[PDB]
Structure 1
Amino acid sequence: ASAPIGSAISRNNWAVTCDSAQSGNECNKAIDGNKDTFWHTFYGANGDPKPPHTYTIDMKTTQNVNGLSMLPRQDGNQNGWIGRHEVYLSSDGTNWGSPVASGSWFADSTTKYSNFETRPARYVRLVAITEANGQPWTSIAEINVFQASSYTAPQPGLGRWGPTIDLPIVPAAAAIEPTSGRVLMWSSYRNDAFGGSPGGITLTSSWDPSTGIVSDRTVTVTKHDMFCPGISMDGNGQIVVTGGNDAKKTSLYDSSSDSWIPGPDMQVARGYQSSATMSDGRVFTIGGSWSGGVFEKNGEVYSPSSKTWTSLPNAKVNPMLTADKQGLYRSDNHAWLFGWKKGSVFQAGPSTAMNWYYTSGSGDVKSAGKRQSNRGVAPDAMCGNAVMYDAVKGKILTFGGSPDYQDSDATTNAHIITLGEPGTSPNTVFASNGLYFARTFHTSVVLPDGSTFITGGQRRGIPFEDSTPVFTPEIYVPEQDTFYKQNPNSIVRVYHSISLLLPDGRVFNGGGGLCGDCTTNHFDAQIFTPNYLYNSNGNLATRPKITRTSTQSVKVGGRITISTDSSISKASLIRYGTATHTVNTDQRRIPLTLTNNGGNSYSFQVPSDSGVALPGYWMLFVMNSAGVPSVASTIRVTQ
């Protein structure tokens, strides 16, 4: 199940309008209180008019609306189940604006919801764009609208949340398809659950930001239930998905061909391990006792060229284990890995102990010291996040998490780690005064300007429970060493949530749940628009445009020339992300130094070290003096 974020609005005084209604299937059956009766558009003898179909409610008065529920027909018949839809709100009945929510609902008879930020409205409209099975009708047994306790206008200058993207699944794993710009999401063998999988199948769903279309596909060709995996974008731009529900499998997603290819089986079965792309395009993984057994799981490395997994038994997992109370089942999970120079992999945590992993010969591990600051040694921070926001300067910000995976209080601890050469102990300091809010299961992304956006989580980690939610996101501004609260959202984002940076510079945040019958499944995502996209008036700022790119494929150390439509002050390269269970080993930012060629023509060199400029796809953003970023250009970085 799912749940709405508000309380049902009394349907007494309401007045409803339908585009069509078959007699016996009146518009009003949708608001009778009887689940046996439903509104149904014309059929048979009244003809079969195709969607869009629309349901408009006049609440007579103004309510602080935050959601809607749609119970489909409960009579065993599927006809009229709503697929694609859009939700609109109006104070007047004529001016509807942009949808506050849109997306697709799964094809079943369960109640479906639309949760969105609170907005005063007297009118609500639900547009059924499609029918779950591609037929013409639209049927609704019951429709409800929910209201918030109160309404507080977002504060100016602090970003904005919305709209809501409704999905058929809980997106507990997601990636950006670099060639298409779509967000690829997956759940498990089911849309809302992972427990009890026969393995071998995964439900995926894609959202296209340009069209707003949500497309779904069941992947069986790799014979892998991809829930709880390792995820990396290799040196070729293929997304490598490892283990999880099918503990030894590897599935490869090729963005180019929009397809899934079986990969080689790993040497060791794992679930919940992290994997990290290396300076040579190879993928290194270690740990993962969620599945495949609980024992010491040492490193192994994937070669995309030979398509083999090779064990690195001397890259030992032992030094990175946390002191988790549940033991090894959790202590080797979600390592904070970063591919670095010369085939090295840095492990920044969650264990207090940081380590250098080496991939030559049969592997090696060397101590990189303890995460600590003038305030003391940092405790284990399972599900804390770690972001490389300046790969050139080896800067990684770490924050949040808790000593144990669950039933433990989250911390506000935040640190800056500065990496040097593999093998050396990196410098670590405390980040400002730590987070404004202790959180675990939160997610984050590095933004075009080098700031880190952090959102969601709870103060005490209780998987599948929406308790102690943190609704106020924070942004860390490295130049200032200061954290800033942003406008809060209304949907709890705790365990199984995700965040990705979109090519347009906005953040996609969604998921949470995946517990079958629980009521904490969140079949949606929201978009957070950072204040760098608005001008002073609260309107969207005008964005610099990248008119020309000399090339879209460059070797490390290579130069790129661009022309813009306006003078640019800054530019950054952001590697495309992948995300699940707080882990994102693929995102990273490289600040670029620009050569002004005169005439709004500029060049920059990509760093010559492939451990900095990890191969794969990257997003190129340019910023005007105002700080407003362009939409990204996609550049492939090869060694």
Structure 2
Amino acid sequence: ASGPLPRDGWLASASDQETANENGRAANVLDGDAATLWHSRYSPAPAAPLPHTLTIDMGVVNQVAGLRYLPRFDNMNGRVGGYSIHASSNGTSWNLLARGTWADNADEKTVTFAAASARYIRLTASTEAGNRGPWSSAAEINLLGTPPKGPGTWSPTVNFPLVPAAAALLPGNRLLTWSAYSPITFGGETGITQSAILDLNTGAVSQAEVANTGHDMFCPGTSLLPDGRILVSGGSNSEKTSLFSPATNTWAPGPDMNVGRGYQSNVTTSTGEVFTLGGSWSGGLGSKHGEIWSSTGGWRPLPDVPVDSILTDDPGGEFRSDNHAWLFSAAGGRVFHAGPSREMNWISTAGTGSVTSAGTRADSADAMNGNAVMYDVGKILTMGGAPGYDNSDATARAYTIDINNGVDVARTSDMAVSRSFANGVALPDGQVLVVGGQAHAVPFTDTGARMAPELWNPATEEWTAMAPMAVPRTYHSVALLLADGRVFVGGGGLCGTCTTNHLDGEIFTPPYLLNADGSARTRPTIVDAPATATAGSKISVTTGSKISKFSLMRMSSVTHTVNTDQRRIPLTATGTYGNNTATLTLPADRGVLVPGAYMLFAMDGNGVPSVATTIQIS
């Protein structure tokens, strides 16, 4: 006997289904409701003949050892008699697991069989149990078995007092999160934000209402400053700027932007300024041209950085098309715009600024709510997204972009599953994790959630599926790297009386931290490293064993799929005279080594990261 597999993310499809005379849609077998059915198509006449099939794509490779069929309770029509059950891993080749005849009664029917690996299970209904008509119906279908064991492992869920739809890592193993004026909904311009800080050492959460900056910071641009503060601008109070200080856990008011905006992207530049572009979610539709903030001057317009060349072809128009730009600081101090629009751009922020076409992202379509992650110097991985923000099929496609000497784009391997609303996380070994999202982008839904993250390795350009998480993470979810090398994932929903809010998170331990058996792997240690350093300097780092590879991982803020802060700079060490002492040479180019808080990870020869130290780089 096996227990039911979780059904999060499953998608049902069928040979045929009724919609005209009743709601007989295939999806109805997955809703938990005994009163909603898949029904084979019978109208308009003529009715679709037997046999009929119902296919479930689980979105992951489970071990399947049985199937439970719950017939409708209201009449006998369409009870399945003769059945077959097939399994597939690739969706192309099918293996027969079971064949039989179910009795003509209302009992839930269970079929068991030897466990089989499968992503897809198909039920074929070959007869109607009482030969009453050419019909098949099913109220619910469950699949019995066990989820994959690894790679990687997930913590139990972590309680939050709000949906953490924005997050930022702080020094000292703490995570700042916030929602909006409410823990569970958004709306208006009421100048209040609910926040919650998770202490990753103890699990304690500290909740605070932030009213002193007159800013509801839902839907903002975010970035980390050189001095460690977090600058948040726009969103529900579209003109506002607020600054968080991790040393005192307080916010301070900043200066207003010139034009109000929301769902824009903000990026810290080589000079420690913050550039912003786009964002028609709030503050008015369109004309969300570039501006740049300095600590001494506040926000100033960039007259020669118009928004126009970043717009996608979103069917929703201006409200959506300037949202969530994939912006990166680049060598020499420009900003590179990698998407989501097909067209990419180089942006200068000096003087009045400039914009220059960088050509298209090869043959990519628009990829709104896709991810872009800087996993090495001048090296970006982009993946997922959909051409529309709303009601749009997502892609599995992924493209690399090398901006070291010009712009070189190449399609790389597809992910195993399409995603929109996922999050991308650079890991210190150079791999990039993608987590969450869903197959068909519809804000505030968990339908078609992608439950298994995938890890892309630049050395192979392949995606490997990770063990699945428990909670779906779609619109309004976040994920980011932690200083111990694990990954926080959380949020989703923020839709009030909706049923899809997730006031929680889960922590993923990636494969590089585990022994084969899932226990914690022994890791290298940093014994001594400087708390601060300046671009272009050499630093000396002491470890508990001989290490030659280190990774500087810039700390992150993230919301609405956007994380302009994270980036990996790998460095090779030169061994010196002491007890595992080594010298690292920091790049002088602050367009690459953007000033701010970094996690310094020692990487052993097995690819195992130390716990990072924090280094504030100027």
Whether 1:330 and 2:344 are equivalent positions in the alignment is no
- Measure the CA separation in 2 of the matches of 1:297 and 1:535: 50
Matches within 5 A, 1:387-426: 387-391=373-377, 394-420=378-404, 424=406, 426=407
The structure 2 residue matched to 1:164, chosen from 154, 157, 160, is 157
Report deviation, 1:569: 4.2
Map 1:459-474 → 2, pairs under 5 A? 459-474=439-454
The answer as to whether partners of 1:334 and 1:583 remain within 8 angstroms in 2 is yes
Helix, strand or coil at the partner of 1:532: helix
- Is residue 495 from structure 1 mapped to residue 481 from structure 2 by the alignment? no
Q: Aligned partners of 2:219, 2:519: CA distance in 1, in Å?
A: 40
Cα distance in 1, alignment partners of residues 7 and 416 from structure 2 = 26
The amino acid that maps onto 2:604 is N
1:263–1:307 contact (8 Å) kept in structure 2: no
Match of 2:608 in 1: 628
- The two structures have a TM-score, normalised by structure 2, of 0.76
User: Which structure 2 residues correspond to residues 407-486 of structure 1 after superposition, within 5 A?
Assistant: 407-420=391-404, 424=406, 426-431=407-412, 433-486=413-466
Match of 1:213 among 204, 217, 224: 204
Q: Answer yes or no: is the 8 Å Cα contact 1:264–1:307 preserved in 2.
A: no
CA distance in 2, matches of 1:170, 1:429: 36
User: Contact 2:222 / 2:231 at 8 angstroms: preserved in 1?
Assistant: yes
Q: How many residues align?
A: 480
Look up the SS of the partner of 2:587 in the other structure.
Answer: coil
Distance 2:261 2:480 in 1: 24
Distance in 2, matches of 1:328 and 1:565, equals 54
Q: Secondary structure at the match of 1:342?
A: helix
Displacement of 1:343 in angstroms is 2.8
The residue that corresponds to 2:86 in the other structure is none
Compute the displacement of 1:237 (Å).
Answer: 1.9
| Secondary structure in structure 2 of the residue aligned to 1:355 | strand
The 2-side partners of 1:537 and 1:472 are apart by 19
* Alignment partners' CA distance in 2, 1:458 and 1:184: 25
Counterparts of 1:196-595 in structure 2, within 5 Å, are 197-304=188-295, 306-372=296-362, 377-391=363-377, 394-420=378-404, 424=406, 426-431=407-412, 433-549=413-529, 551-595=530-574
Aligned-partner Cα distance in 1 for 2:421–2:518: 31
In 2: Cα distance, 1:361 partner to 1:489 partner: 47
What is the CA-CA distance between 1:626 and the residue it aligns to? 2.1
Match of 2:72? Answer: none
The counterpart of 1:177, out of the listed 166, 170, 174, is 170
Partner of 1:608: 588
Q: What is the distance in 1 between the residues matched to 2:239 and 2:278? A: 13
In structure 2, distance between residues paired with 1:547 and 1:414: 39
Offset of 1:252 from its aligned partner?
0.3
1:532 and 1:364 mapped to 2: Cα distance?
A: 42
Contact 2:535–2:588 (8 Å) recurs in 1: yes
- Give the aligned partner of residue 598 of structure 2: 618
Q: Residues 153 and 382 of structure 1: is their aligned pair in 2 closer, same or farther, counting only changes over 3 Å? A: closer
Query: Quick check: 2:370–2:385 contact (8 Å CA) kept in 1?
Result: yes
Residue 410 of structure 2 aligns with an amino acid whose one-letter code is V
SS of match in other structure, 1:456 = strand
1:496-517 per-residue CA deviation (whole Å, 9 max, x = no partner) reads 0000101110000000000000
State the 4+ residue runs in structure 1 displaced beyond 3 angstroms: 148-151
Aligned residue type for 1:493: R
Q: Following TM superposition, by how much is the alpha carbon of 1:162 offset from its aligned partner in structure 2, in angstroms?
A: 1.4
RMSD: 1.6
Q: Is the 8 A contact 1:511 1:524 kept in 2?
A: yes
Question: Is the 2:547–2:573 Cα contact (8 Å) retained in structure 1?
Answer: no
Residue 126 (structure 2) aligns with: none
Q: Deviations over 1:377-432 (max 9, x none)?
A: 111000010000002xx1000000000001110011101100036xx4x000111x
SS of aligned partner of 2:319: helix
Match of 1:192 among 184, 202, 209: 184
Please say which of residues 453-462 and 230-239 is displaced more in the overlay. Answer: 230-239
In 1, are the aligned partners of 2:548 and 2:575 still within 8 Å (CA)?
Answer: no
1:324-368: CA deviation from partner (whole Å, max 9, x where unpaired): 001010000000000113331100000000001111111110000
Q: How far did residue 149 of structure 1 move?
A: 6.4
Q: Is the 8 A contact 1:274 1:336 kept in 2?
A: yes
- Contact 1:189–1:200, Cα closer than 8 Å, also in 2: yes
Which residue of 1 is the match for residue 149 of structure 2? 155
Q: Which amino acid aligns with 1:168?
A: P
The amino acid that maps onto 2:441 is: G
Q: Is the 8 A contact 1:352 1:378 kept in 2?
A: yes
1:586 Cα deviation from its structure 2 partner: 0.3
Query: 1:340 is matched by which residue type in structure 2?
Result: A
Letter of the aligned partner of 1:309 in structure 2? W
User: What per-residue deviation string (whole Å, max 9, x for no partner) do you get for residues 448-502 of structure 1?
Assistant: 1010011111110011111011111100000111110111122110000000101
Amino acid in structure 2 at the alignment position of 1:429: A
Q: Deviations over 1:247-272 (max 9, x none)?
A: 00000001122210100000110000
1:525 Cα offset (Å)? 0.3
Q: Percent identity?
A: 49
SS at match of 2:182: coil
Instruction: Give the C-alpha shift of residue 548 in structure 1.
Output: 1.1
Largest Rg, 1 or 2:
2
After superposition, the C-alpha distances for 1:201-242 in whole angstroms (9 at most, x for unaligned) are 000001001111011000011110000000011222211101
Unaligned runs of 5+ in 1: 8-147
Give, in whole Å, the separation in 1 of the partners of 2:247 and 2:490: 25
Residues 507 and 150 of structure 1: is their aligned pair in 2 closer, same or farther, counting only changes over 3 Å?
farther
Question: Match of 1:63?
Answer: none
Asked if structure 2 preserves the Cα contact closer than 8 Å seen for 1:323 and 1:331, the reply is yes
TM-score by length of 1: 0.74
- Name the counterpart of 2:127: none
- Give deviations 1:25-63, integer Å, cap 9, x for gaps: xxxxxxxxxxxxxxxxxxxxxxxxxxxxxxxxxxxxxxx
